[PDB]
Amino acid sequence: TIQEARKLLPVHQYKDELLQEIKKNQVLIIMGETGSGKTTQLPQYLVEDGFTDQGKLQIAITQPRRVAATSVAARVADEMNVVLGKEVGYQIRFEDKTTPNKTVLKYMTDGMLLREFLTDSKLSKYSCIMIDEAHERTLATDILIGLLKDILPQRPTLKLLISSATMNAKKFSEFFDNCPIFNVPGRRYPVDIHYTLQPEANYIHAAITTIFQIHTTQSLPGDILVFLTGQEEIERTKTKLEEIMSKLGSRTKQMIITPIYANLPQEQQLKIFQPTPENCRKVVLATNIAETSLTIDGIRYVIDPGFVKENSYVPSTGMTQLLTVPCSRASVDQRAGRAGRVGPGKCFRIFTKWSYLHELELMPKPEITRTNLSNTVLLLLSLGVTDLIKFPLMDKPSIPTLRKSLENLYILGALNSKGTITRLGKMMCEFPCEPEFAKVLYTAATHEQCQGVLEECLTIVSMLHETPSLFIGQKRDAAASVLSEVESDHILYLEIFNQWRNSKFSRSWCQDHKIQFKTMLRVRNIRNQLFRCSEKVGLVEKNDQARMKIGNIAGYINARITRCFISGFPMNIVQLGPTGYQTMGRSSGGLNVSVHPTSILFVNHKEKAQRPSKYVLYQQLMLTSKEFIRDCLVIPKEEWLIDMVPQIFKDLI
Numbered sequence: 001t002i003q004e005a006r007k008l009l010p011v012h013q014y015k016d017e018l019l020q021e022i023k024k025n026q027v028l029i030i031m032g033e034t035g036s037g038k039t040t041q042l043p044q045y046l047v048e049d050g051f052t053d054q055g056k057l058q059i060a061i062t063q064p065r066r067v068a069a070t071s072v073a074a075r076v077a078d079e080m081n082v083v084l085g086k087e088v089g090y091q092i093r094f095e096d097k098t099t100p101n102k103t104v105l106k107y108m109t110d111g112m113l114l115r116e117f118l119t120d121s122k123l124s125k126y127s128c129i130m131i132d133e134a135h136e137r138t139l140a141t142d143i144l145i146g147l148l149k150d151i152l153p154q155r156p157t158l159k160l161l162i163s164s165a166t167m168n169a170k171k172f173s174e175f176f177d178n179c180p181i182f183n184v185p186g187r188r189y190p191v192d193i194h195y196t197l198q199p200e201a202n203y204i205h206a207a208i209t210t211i212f213q214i215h216t217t218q219s220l221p222g223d224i225l226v227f228l229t230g231q232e233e234i235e236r237t238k239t240k241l242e243e244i245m246s247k248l249g250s251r252t253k254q255m256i257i258t259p260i261y262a263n264l265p266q267e268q269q270l271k272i273f274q275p276t277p278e279n280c281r282k283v284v285l286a287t288n289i290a291e292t293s294l295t296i297d298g299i300r301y302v303i304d305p306g307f308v309k310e311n312s313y314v315p316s317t318g319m320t321q322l323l324t325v326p327c328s329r330a331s332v333d334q335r336a337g338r339a340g341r342v343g344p345g346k347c348f349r350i351f352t353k354w355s356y357l358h359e360l361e362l363m364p365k366p367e368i369t370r371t372n373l374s375n376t377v378l379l380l381l382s383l384g385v386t387d388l389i390k391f392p393l394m395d396k397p398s399i400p401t402l403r404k405s406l407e408n409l410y411i412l413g414a415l416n417s418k419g420t421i422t423r424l425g426k427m428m429c430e431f432p433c434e435p436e437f438a439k440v441l442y443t444a445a446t447h448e449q450c451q452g453v454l455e456e457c458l459t460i461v462s463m464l465h466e467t468p469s470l471f472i473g474q475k476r477d478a479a480a481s482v483l484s485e486v487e488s489d490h491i492l493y494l495e496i497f498n499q500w501r502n503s504k505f506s507r508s509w510c511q512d513h514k515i516q517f518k519t520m521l522r523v524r525n526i527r528n529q530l531f532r533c534s535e536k537v538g539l540v541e542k543n544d545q546a547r548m549k550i551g552n553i554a555g556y557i558n559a560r561i562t563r564c565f566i567s568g569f570p571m572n573i574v575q576l577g578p579t580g581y582q583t584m585g586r587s588s589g590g591l592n593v594s595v596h597p598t599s600i601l602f603v604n605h606k607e608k609a610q611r612p613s614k615y616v617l618y619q620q621l622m623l624t625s626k627e628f629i630r631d632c633l634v635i636p637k638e639e640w641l642i643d644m645v646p647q648i649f650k651d652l653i
Helices: 012-024 038-048 066-080 110-114 139-151 169-175 203-217 231-248 266-272 329-336 353-359 374-383 399-412 423-428 435-446 454-465 475-482 489-502 507-512 517-537 539-549 557-568 600-606 639-644 646-652
Strands: 027-032 058-063 088-091 105-109 126-131 159-165 181-184 191-195 223-227 254-259 280-286 299-304 307-313 320-326 345-349 573-576 581-583 615-617 620-623 627-630 633-635
Touching: 012 027, 012 038, 012 181, 027 038, 027 169, 038 058, 038 066, 038 105, 038 126, 038 159, 058 066, 058 110, 066 088, 066 105, 066 266, 105 110, 110 139, 126 139, 139 169, 139 374, 159 169, 169 181, 203 223, 203 231, 203 280, 203 299, 203 345, 231 254, 231 280, 254 266, 299 329, 329 345, 374 399, 374 423, 374 435, 399 435, 423 435, 435 454, 435 517, 435 539, 435 557, 454 489, 454 517, 454 539, 454 557, 475 489, 475 600, 489 507, 489 517, 489 557, 489 600, 507 517, 517 539, 557 615, 557 633, 557 639, 639 646
Parallel strands: 027 159, 027 181, 058 105, 058 126, 088 105, 126 159, 191 345, 223 280, 223 299, 254 280, 299 345, 320 620
Antiparallel strands: 307 320, 573 581, 573 615, 615 633, 620 627
């Protein structure tokens, strides 16, 4: 029974003591551990009272991850026994699955409640707001904690709830005028922690052996959790795991593999949240802790390599590179505590104990100290915050981080010479995307050398959001089926969606060209969001007049698109050299990047070899044993650099 397992959670004994503490205090900090029923059961408790209204107000619950916000919202819709999106909803950056006048409690990302301040600055739609996993200290949470502190004198009726770990709840108390702290402790069972003998390279090889030693010799039921560092490694480990499982057959036992990553099908969302039968051993592959929580929570084994992917800040250029780093000592200890929720557990760590003591860091650094603040500062200037380091944030950014982020906003055109937001900067805040993607859609409709290609650029920007999950198999075998001798990666993404339109968006088209069909329905959905915002801004009407007056149905129409991305991304330009590709930027002598093997520019140099290009634009940088470049674009001539961004590129050339 899913109704009686709710009463066995640790928060239920504190239920009546919670609610009387909410009615007295405006802000309350709820100390505890993740998955103790804080995030799940407190929204049902506040709706059982009159905290919202009969139907007038709402409850907003903030999750730091995208997949945590969707998966917990479906799990609550089971316990509420309502259809997801009718009384219980979620609001992701391109998914708004909420009825406008029926949703009572909705679970949104931390970045998506920052967007809510733009339309409604006092947050008049919500009754109470709960900030879950505030101890993780993301960038969008840290700004939102600072923004909510301003409007607390200005609105007395609202209730604010900060959920955090036991270690960090005192820092939030000093920040909120000596706010009272309520403690809902998790039931702690003894977890045994195993450190391996030597330092272990190729942790995914060691992890497969660790699963099988658990699965054969340990009695049912106790389930296995493996923390994998990314979304691609979960699928590679899953596919490898049935290969060994098919070899055994029904000889020893049964193994059910359950992945948890972003944008799973609805058939997979049910399979995560169901009890295993007898003689069935569930193995769960996830990335973070907050997705793994569940009401019955039969899982009793945890395997922890100790790595996490982060978007570490790059000093030379403005943006971040996707970098995998060792987890902090506080984060590793929280992963070991996942085992002992219902019974005693065992934690197998793929790193030695000497690395646990000396090599690891004690507390993770806040995300605001090493990031690109451009999307934040543009939102803070748009919202009325005129002073940048006077704002009441609990941790302040670096001054060279903020100087680099302000001068990247000035070159992008979102700020004046004084530092005020301009009409373009007000325009970039309307679009539900990065400000550099908004500059490309602005250049495509307005710029005198570039106008007329907004409909093509809306296609390419929608494709760049869903790039890693576009195609099944190798890219080149899918690329040559679609269109041959494609020089740059952005033009390839334009051709796939255009031909998919011409087949009336059919499923049968995508199997024949080896493209994931569920991805393309996400890409078409992103385009519908970006097109409605372009009408509301008015770029669509300006696009049609530029199209009605000038029509290039020739090789210019892909030259104009190339110019639109140089104005949007002038910092992501790479120059060919004797040593190799090298970042253009004047702050550094060289970064010595290289092309990632998946992108089409690597294919053109290796197979049917063409001459390498002198200048190349990219969308994403990463450091996996050397610097890699994805979503390439060939800039065939120097003059497009000096024409489009003369501020940077007259110095360089």
